[PDB]
Fold Kappa-stichotoxin-She3a.
Amino acid sequence: RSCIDTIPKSRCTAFQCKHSMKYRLSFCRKTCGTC
Amino acid sequence: RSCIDTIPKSRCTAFQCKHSMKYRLSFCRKTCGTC
Amino acid sequence: RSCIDTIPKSRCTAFQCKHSMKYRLSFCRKTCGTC
Ligand SMILES: [Li+]
Ligand SMILES: [Li+]
């Protein structure tokens, strides 16, 4: 999978990176630090 | 989430923006350029 | 982190303070007003 966020990164939060697998690995993958 | 830094911006560093999700998205969100 | 510019301040611009996290927080940290 490419290392990108698929939604605008202003819509990504630390809460969602900890609590949501889909935010952490898909919507906000890059800014959550997965890649 | 509002576009602010929650710690003083003079404690935010590029290192923390690059290497810490919580700095990049929460403590230093604005000054890291997330929003 | 010390409040200094790590490049000569004559190379620092408002545009780089606004649009680049590394200039804002590192290269031009002092002249950009981060500290
Ligand atoms: Li997120
Ligand atoms: Li600059």
